[PDB]
Amino acid sequence: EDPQLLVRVRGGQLRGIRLKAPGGPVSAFLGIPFAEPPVGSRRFMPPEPKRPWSGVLDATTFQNVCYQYVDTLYPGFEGTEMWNPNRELSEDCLYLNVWTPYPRPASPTPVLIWIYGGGFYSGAASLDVYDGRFLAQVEGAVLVSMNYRVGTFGFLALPGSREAPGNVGLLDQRLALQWVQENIAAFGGDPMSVTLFGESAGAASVGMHILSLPSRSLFHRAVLQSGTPNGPWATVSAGEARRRATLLARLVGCNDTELIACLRTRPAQDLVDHEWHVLPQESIFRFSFVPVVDGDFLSDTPEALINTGDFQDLQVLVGVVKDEGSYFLVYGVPGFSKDNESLISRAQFLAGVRIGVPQASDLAAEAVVLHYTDWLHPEDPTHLRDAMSAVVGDHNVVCPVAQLAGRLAAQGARVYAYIFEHRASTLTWPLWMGVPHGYEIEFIFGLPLDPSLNYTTEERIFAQRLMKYWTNFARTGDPNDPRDSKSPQWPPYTTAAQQYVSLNLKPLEVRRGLRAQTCAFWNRFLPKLLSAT
């Protein structure tokens, strides 16, 4: 019985496990319950805090993955399987994980809290790419990750109702953040220094805690990687959530109380079986059950809240990868596949745009096509393919990120922005996809430091650089190394200069304007268009 592996938290005693990291041991406390299992009459309901337990709770293994759809498009392919559940599925999944250095930190250590992505319909804190042992061992960080409900279980809503108020998945995350405030000191983490970080939906989630007052006293800094609370996919209106919910009810055969009561009797997989049949149009980068503008967790739309918020005492790091949209193209656009170079025709490009920008009118879709066509090579298949990727990546991530960076900076926040451009030597997706959505993560978590994973020695040095930026940012709100001249320095993003840095194998390079002309098209012109026509 190793005393470094024994901790007492408000609910009782835990026993963690000593894990091996390249440079030494780390202490890990896996599968800690933070809420009562949201099962049975608790489905669709806000989480309740976990009741105290007797004895010593075993926290040496990952708990179950929240019930969710499992990808089958490319069976056996590592590019997709790496995101699939790696533990048993179950609605009983509200558990979090903590990694800390071994022996546990002498003094209070800044805490990093990871919120995974997966379109709000999938993901889990147990995936290999979210392994917190590297950051814990190399930087001495206390890393926390929680499971939160996805899909219908976490976001199906009958707005205004008592039994499916919506956003419970964000409330699960909030409860895990409260748990960190109340218990993280027992592990040597500083509750006064908590940095939230996440990617994609995880990033939009971090964004939603920034915009919801009750979350604000639970963290101090934030990192949003390829995702935002604003934008076309992260939220839906009350009306649309109600619409998708009742359409799902109907599809499984079911006054809000009775509808929800009937939904609660259905096996989990029945709900997942019809999840994807409620989207209003054929599309990509669109998810059935996501946060809802409820006038509660989200007092107004993310757009309204970021345009009028006071972000004075907040530091934020945000960024995108080089090819945000490639990955999504193979999941719905005719002509695209991971197995060929996906050289498409102009006709397939125009078709792709209606799928890529599903809420777009014919005039608006025409404007997108004319803006993205390279008029010197309007029929070149390679140009048309890369353009289709750009349309999807810009519309969904880059421009919504440029928009958020700008409002937070204009309104008092300290902002740092980046563009990640290194393509992992180990990537299994084809070259035409470039640096896809989600592939910067393994670097920030430091996986290249595991010699058995076969990353190049340059990638290992790169990952160390990134872990430093993130942890420096967590410690101080500034990603630059405190004692180190010559770098060059990563400057704050501002509305005036619009500076951001490229993260790749070469030293930091400062650039200006995040797709400035193109995002002006998405952020200023298209809005003006559709609100008139």
Ligand X SMILES: *[C@@H]1O[C@H](CO[C@@H]2O[C@@H](C)[C@@H](O)[C@@H](O)[C@@H]2O)[C@@H](O)[C@H](O)[C@H]1NC(C)=O
| Catalytic residue numbers, as ranges | 200, 324, 437
Whose tokens are 């745009």? That residue is 353
For 83-94, give the DSSP string: TS-SS-EES---
For a copy of itself, give the closer residue by CB, 248 or 388. 388
Sheet holding 12-15, edge to edge: 6-9, 12-15, 56-58
State which of residues 337, 361, 428, 454 lies at the interface with ligand X (CB under 6 A).
337
Q: Is residue 149 a contact partner of residue 178, using CB atoms and an 8 Å limit?
A: no
State which of residues 61, 265, 299, 337 lies at the interface with ligand NAG (CB under 6 A).
337
The item of a copy of itself, ligand X, ligand NAG, none sharing an interface with residue 454, based on CB under 5 to 8 Å by kind, is ligand NAG
Q: In degrees, to the nearest 5, what angle opens at C-alpha 315 toward C-alphas 312 and 318?
A: 125
Cβ 327 to ligand X shortest distance, Å? 16
Q: Is residue 283 a contact partner of residue 360, using CB atoms and an 8 Å limit?
A: no
Binding mask 297-336 for ligand X (x = CB under 6 A): --------------------------------------x-
Cβ 361 to a copy of itself shortest distance, Å? 9
Q: Which of 53, 43, 17, 80 is nearest to 439 (CA)?
A: 80
Q: Give dist(CA 346, CA 236) in Å, integer.
A: 32
Whose tokens are 């209070």? That residue is 108
The region of 192-200, 338-346, 398-406, 439-447 touching ligand NAG under the rule CB under 6 A is: 338-346
Please state the φ and ψ torsions of residue 487, each to the nearest 5 degrees.
-155, -75
**Looking at the chain, after which residues does the C atom sit over 2.5 Å from the next written N, breaking the chain?**
254
Q: Give dist(CA 312, CA 116) in Å, integer.
A: 27
State which of residues 58, 78, 339, 374 lies at the interface with ligand X (CB under 6 A).
339
Tokens of 291: 């946060």
Site for a copy of itself in 354-413 (CB under 8 A): 363, 366-367, 370, 373, 375-376
Site membership for a copy of itself, residue 510 (CB under 8 A): no
Taking the mean position of all CA atoms in its chain, how far away is CA 516? 24
Other residues' Cβ atoms within 10 Å of the Cβ of residue 456: 13
Q: Is residue 404 a contact partner of residue 417, using CB atoms and an 8 Å limit?
A: no
Cβ 358 to ligand X shortest distance, Å? 20
Site for a copy of itself in 439-498 (CB under 8 A): 498
Burial class (CB in 10 A: 0-12, 13-18, 19+), 36: middle
Site for ligand NAG in 276-315 (CB under 6 A): none
State which of residues 151, 154, 335, 436 lies at the interface with ligand NAG (CB under 6 A).
335
State which of residues 265, 269, 281, 340 lies at the interface with ligand X (CB under 6 A).
340
The item of a copy of itself, ligand NAG, ligand X, none sharing an interface with residue 457, based on CB under 5 to 8 Å by kind, is none
Q: Which residues contact 5 (CB under 8 A, 6 or more apart)?
A: 15, 16, 17, 18, 27
Site membership for ligand X, residue 47 (CB under 6 A): no
The region of 83-91, 107-115, 334-342, 368-376 touching ligand NAG under the rule CB under 6 A is: 334-342
Q: Give dist(CA 197, CA 229) in Å, integer.
A: 13
The region of 53-61, 291-299, 318-326, 341-349 touching ligand NAG under the rule CB under 6 A is: 341-349
For ligand NAG, give the closer residue by CB, 297 or 445. 445
Residues that bind a copy of itself (CB under 8 A): 363, 366-367, 370, 373, 375-376, 498, 512-513, 516-517, 519-521, 524-525, 528-529, 532-533
Residues that bind ligand X (CB under 6 A): 335, 337, 339-340, 342
Residues that bind ligand NAG (CB under 6 A): 335, 337, 339-343, 453-454
